Structure 1
Amino acid sequence: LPALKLALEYIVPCMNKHGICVVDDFLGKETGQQIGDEVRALHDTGKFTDGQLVSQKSDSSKDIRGDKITWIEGKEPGCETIGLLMSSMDDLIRHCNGKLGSYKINGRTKAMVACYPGNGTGYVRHVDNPNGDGRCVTCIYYLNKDWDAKVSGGILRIFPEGKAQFADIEPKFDRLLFFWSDRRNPHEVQPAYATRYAITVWYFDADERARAKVKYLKGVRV
């Protein structure tokens, strides 16, 4: 689908009604697989961190580490289909802008590529932006071929604020997810028992970000 049709007919209505939006088959199989290939090359060539420290034992040979990450700008050698994904996410947001609540989105982070190594680690319940650091929208792309959570775990579970229910999102190949980054969407990743990849970017609201400058300390000489 053309970005604008997806934006006006799906992302804008879903985001304003539910604060969560899932688009399946975002880029198609060829491109999705190429992204899988590039992420796997990053992993295989040692570009990820070792992983979040999950269990600190007094013996460090038995430390457990979880999600591994690497920040990707999209123009690096071997990351160009990742850059293509980032640009397609941006096209969608650009065609939403002015219609996502009353936010005015004026930028985004680099891509955070995540690798859950499959050792029973997940990601604890959290809010992405709990303290007003400028990020208003979380965008995640999943590239896990034939993922079956009943077998491999790794569900993303969101707990929309105020609701007595949660939303389980499988990290399915070629799946695109949007949700409000703030306290309306606490979420977690349940333990993953197979290698699980995701690519996240966060979009900034202009006003909040302009205040996060001072809430986060920048100076100029006299």
Structure 2
Amino acid sequence: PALKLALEYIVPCMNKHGICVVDDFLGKETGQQIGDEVRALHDTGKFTDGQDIRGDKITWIEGKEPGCETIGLLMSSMDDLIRHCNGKLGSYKINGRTKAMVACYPGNGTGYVRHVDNPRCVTCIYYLNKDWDAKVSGGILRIFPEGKAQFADIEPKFDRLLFFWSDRRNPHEVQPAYATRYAITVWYFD
């Protein structure tokens, strides 16, 4: 229930850590339906080059396109969490969000050099990779939260939702992927 997830977990977590992970966000059935939609997009060659900086291929999805209705459901689900966060007494307001950025790292040692997404703004990432073994497949998101002496390594696990502040508080990189690695990102801003 968004009301509870936002107010009891996401807000305090974002306040304390600036990074929040929610596993099993939508469940396996819905998650694999999104997986199947992303693969269909990928199989038709609709992804364009995300660019020495990044090896990903991407497409932007509004959520109402034929074949994209479950991706639209994911977006509505993220929207509701953000709405409950920004509706808290004393909170700043979000005025917009991007379309869904569907991204594929097509193995072959592709990754993303360390960067800052927006050098407020929140990055929301939903991962789609079932039984991902990072030891063999790579693709770890390494994040450097401000204030911590350690970095955090986040596996791009199926049905995992990740929030983090998009600004210089959270530089991050995608370590090289050696298997096809899928994710969907939405940025919430202003």
TM-score bucket of the superposed structures, by smaller chain: over 0.9
User: Aligned partners of 2:165, 2:53: CA distance in 1, in Å?
Assistant: 30
TM (norm. structure 1) is: 0.81
**Could you tell me how far 1:48 is from its partner in structure 2?**
0.3
Among 128, 133, 142, the alignment partner of 1:143 is 128
Aligned alpha-carbon RMSD (Å): 2.1
Between structure 1 and structure 2, the one with the greater Rg is: 1
- CA shift, 1:163, in A, is 2.5
Q: Give the superposition deviation at 1:65.
A: 7.4
Could you tell me how far apart the structure 1 residues matched to 2:133 and 2:56 are?
A: 19
The runs of at least 4 aligned residues of structure 1 exceeding 4 Å deviation read 62-65, 98-102
1:10-25 paired onto structure 2 within 5 Å: 10-25=9-24
Cα deviations across residues 76-125 of structure 1 (Å, max 9, x unaligned)?
Answer: 11000000000000001101114498431122010101000001011000
Identity in percent:
99
Gaps of 5+ in 1: 52-61, 205-222
Matches of 1:21 and 1:31 in 2, distance apart? 21
Task: Please state whether the residue corresponding to 1:32 is helix, strand or coil.
Answer: helix
Larger proportion of strand: 2
Superposed CA deviations along residues 45-82 of structure 1, whole A, max 9, x for unmatched, are: 1110145xxxxxxxxxx999710000000011100000
Aligned residues: 189
Question: CA 1:106/1:136 → structure 2, altered by over 3 Å: closer, same or farther?
Answer: same
Instruction: State how far apart, in whole Å, the 2-side matches of 1:29 and 1:156 are.
Output: 22
Contact 1:12 1:100 in 2 (8 A): no
By how many angstroms is 1:34 displaced?
Answer: 0.2
Change (3 A) 1:138 1:65: closer
1:127: Cα distance to partner?
0.2
Does the 8 Å CA contact 2:54/2:113 hold for their aligned counterparts?
no
TM-score w.r.t. the length of structure 2 is 0.94
* Cα distance in 2 for residues equivalent to 1:63 and 1:18: 31
